[PDB]
């Protein structure tokens, strides 16, 4: 009943920079090498849009390979994108993780989940009704709950030495179809000792309705980008805060500024 996704690609501008170390600095330029999102690279966009003619719903949620990190952006309203699923096969043969944050509170679970076909949360913008994410979970190792109740939301996912790293940022924007442009820095929020082999991830969606037992559609979009091994340069102010950065493999002025 769904429609073939439009795998359109926009330009990533100068986004995707995060904090790579926990040392404290003041007015220092530091050159590093790591796994970062390259400047001005194709960012693949998936959309959730209202049906017009019939069962034309664009309910995008494929399996996107993790590779060596992930950058995930969301432009939406009324909190349609809520949670993430990490795993290897995403079956009940291998342990998997769900990192839901909305709903009652942030629920972080590592179990042997048997997921359904559409990880869709059947709720609305408030006073939620049901929850459709699981079918069975036999052997659970980690269960944590954190007390907590058009925009731009940014996340970065990494997996190093058995630790899952999650970085987050938020901004308020106004746009219709294109992708924004600007500079953002991502602060470290989450670091979890899970120690599992992550090769695939999937998103969780919600279907807003009008006080009815039938649910359908919303207006939103989420963007995916993959990380690559690069070298970059960063700048720090008096009180530690990244003000700008450069990509030392983009254009000759960049290697000049990097040498």
């Amino acid at each position: 009943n769904k429609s073939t996704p439009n795998l359109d690609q926009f330009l990533s501008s100068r986004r995707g920079f995060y904090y790579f170390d926990d040392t404290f600095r003041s007015s220092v330029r530091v050159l590093t090498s790591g796994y970062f999102l390259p400047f001005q690279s194709n960012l693949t966009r998936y959309l959730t849009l209202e049906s017009i003619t019939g069962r034309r719903i664009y309910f995008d949620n494929p399996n996107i390979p993790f590779k060596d990190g992930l950058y995930f952006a969301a432009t939406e309203k009324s909190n349609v994108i809520r949670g993430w699923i990490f795993g290897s096969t995403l079956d009940n043969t291998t342990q998997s993780a769900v990192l839901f944050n909305n709903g009652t509170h942030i629920v972080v679970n590592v179990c042997n989940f048997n997921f359904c076909q559409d990880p869709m949360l059947a709720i609305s913008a408030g006073s939620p009704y049901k929850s459709w994410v699981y079918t069975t979970a036999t052997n659970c190792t980690y269960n944590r709950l954190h007390a907590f109740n058009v925009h731009l939301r940014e996340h970065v996912f990494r997996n190093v030495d058995g630790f899952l790293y999650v970085y987050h940022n938020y901004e308020s924007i106004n746009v219709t179809n294109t992708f924004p442009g600007g500079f953002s820095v991502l602060k470290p929020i989450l670091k979890l000792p899970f120690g599992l082999n992550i090769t695939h991830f999937k998103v969780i969606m919600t279907l807003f309705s009008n006080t009815t037992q039938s649910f359908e559609a919303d207006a939103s979009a989420y963007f995916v980008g993959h990380l690559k091994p690069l070298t970059m340069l960063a700048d720090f102010d008096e009180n530690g805060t990244i003000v700008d950065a450069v990509d030392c493999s983009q254009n000759p002025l960049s290697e000049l500024k990097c040498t």
């Binding site: 404290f24 220092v28 009180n239 530690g240």
Partner: protein, 49 residues
Amino acid sequence: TGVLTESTKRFQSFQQFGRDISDFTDSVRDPKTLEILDISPCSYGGVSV
């Protein structure tokens, strides 16, 4: 080893010590008081005979 004195610096929320470009420690949060201090070489300057 050195003299400890009162401090007027600002620390970014949780932070235990601060250094400089030469990696010389010059500040500690001195727990049980939480009042930032300053460290200084015992002798610094110059003495001629």
